[PDB]
A paper describes a structure:
The cow antibody repertoire contains a unique subset (~10%) of antibodies possessing ultralong CDRH3s, which can reach lengths between 50 to 70 amino acids. The unique [name] structure can be separated into two microdomains where the antigen-binding disulfide-bound “knob” sits on top of a long b-ribbon “stalk” and can bind to both surface and receded epitopes. Ultimately, we isolated a total of 8 and 11 cross-clade nAbs from cow-485 and cow-488, respectively, all of which had ultralong CDRH3s, suggesting only ultralong antibodies were responsible for cross-clade neutralization detected in sera. BnAbs from cow-485 were named Bess, while bnAbs from cow-488 were named ElsE and assigned numbers based on their order of discovery.
The ElsE Fabs all have CDRH3s with 54 amino acids and 4 cysteines, with a 1–3, 2–4 connectivity, Bess7 has a 61-amino acid [name] with 8 cysteines (1–6, 2–5, 3–7, 4–8 connectivity), while the 55-amino acid [name] knob region for Bess 4 (6 Cys, 1–3, 2–5, 4–6 connectivity) has no ordered electron density in the crystal structure. Ultralong bovine [name] knob regions fold with 3 short β-strands connected by 2 loops (Loop1, Loop2) of varying lengths that can adopt a multitude of different secondary structures, including loops, helices and β-turns. The ElsE series of Fabs all have highly similar knob structures as expected from their high sequence similarity. Flexibility in the stalk is evident in a comparison of the ElsE family of structures that have similar [name] knob sequences and structures, but very different orientations of knob domains with respect to the body of the Fab. For example, there are two Fabs in the [name] asymmetric unit with a relative difference in the knob orientation of ~114°. The ability of the knobs to twist and rotate with respect to the body of the Fab likely enhances the ability of bovine Fabs to access recessed epitopes. There is no convincing electron density to indicate tyrosine sulfation modifications in any of the antibody [name] regions; however, BLI experiments indicate that Bess7, with 3 tyrosines in [name], contains one or more sulfated tyrosines. Low sulfate occupancy or flexibility in the [name] knob region may explain the lack of electron density for these groups. The ElsE lineage was the most potent and broad overall.
Numbering used by the authors:
A (entry chain H): 2 to 82, 82A, 82B, 82C, 83 to 159, 161 to 263
B (entry chain L): 2 to 9, 11 to 27, 27A, 27B, 28 to 95, 95A, 95B, 96 to 106, ...
The structure:
Amino acid sequence: VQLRESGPSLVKPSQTLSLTCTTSGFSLSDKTVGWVRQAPGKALEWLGSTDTSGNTGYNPGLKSRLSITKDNSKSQVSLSVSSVSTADSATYYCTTVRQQTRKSCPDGWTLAKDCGFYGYGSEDCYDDCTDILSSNTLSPTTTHEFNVDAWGQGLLVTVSSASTKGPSVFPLAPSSKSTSGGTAALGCLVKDYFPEPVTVSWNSGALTSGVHTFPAVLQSSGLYSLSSVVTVPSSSLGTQTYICNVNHKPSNTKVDKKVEPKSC
Amino acid sequence: AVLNQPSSVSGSLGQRVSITCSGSSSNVGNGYVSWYQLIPGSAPRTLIYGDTSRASGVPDRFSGSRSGNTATLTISSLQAEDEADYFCASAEDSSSNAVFGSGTTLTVLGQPKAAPSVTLFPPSSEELQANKATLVCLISDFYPGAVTVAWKADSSPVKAGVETTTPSKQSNNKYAASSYLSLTPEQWKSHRSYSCQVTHEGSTVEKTVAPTEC
């Protein structure tokens, strides 16, 4: 079971953001799906969902601006937010949700469904199912149950009038004066790029030990930059090539940079 | 509105930790609260759903409870992997209207103290041949997560051009941070040397880099 968000990473104000979640591992005709979003440094926020019966419900405060649809054949849920602002910048998560309106009866009483009654009065609590027509009746107690079952990885969407910009990748070469005897730190500077995010791997994933991709800084220019470093054996600086594989989906860009060792 | 959780909560390894999630009757009073775990760089993780019931894959040290309009998440023996953010959630007036809590940042104290290893990178040829210069000071493998970074040009203060990240964990649960000095290639060649000075736990490590050579 997996949920993969797709769509734009940047959206100008007053326009309409639209995402699509493609589902696998299960059958969309057997689960409810929804959308959660989280603004940076803010709490989770609920958007909406659409259940097995194609019925959609929304965050009351955001219903007028929301639109969720679904295609059970294409295994694909869709979200749309209208007239977005910078407040709509957030990471948008696709989720399988468990929504249940639950009716329960006091102790000793029983619901019509459990009595096996059905009909028009199929929603009351009964004193004894032994006699439907002479039993005492209570209105049920209503509890609403909500769970997010599985979470999608998320998709960061930024709302800004500024334009997309890919990254410049500069090597952080390890000098013979920046070694630490046995180990040496080399990296890649990912400079000037918008919007977030950037991800960095090394040797096409085949190098994992010692790696740390730092968070991004927001320069005064309105562009983001970060660095990815890995500490490697200092004896291998001439015998093992080290390539950082940067990836910036917001501009469909992907960079590979040889980090060559400084002559000194 | 949102469910009131504590901003942050602390707890040392092995100890017991509890996170409160207070609301009202229409939401938390409805008796079906859920708890989720968010580790940075990982998809949020569902922990507790049926007020007390554990989801699939959840260890038994996690446990849920509720007393009226205040839920509670309880970790019996805190681990290092348990350092993260934790959100409660409840439906209000309908199953399609969900409210989340303000969130709580859980800190796992008790890690060994560690001293930072600092490296300073001068502007590269590539970055220079494009009319830019950026010095990259990378700070790793230290605990606790509170460093002070100072930039000096010929031992004088750099009062501008500095963007610094807040420290964040790495795969080994130690902290790491980064500071940048953004210069024109003329300010690079202007001075004799630049210095990144990292003060962590009464020590100051200064790495120096010179335009003359390497």
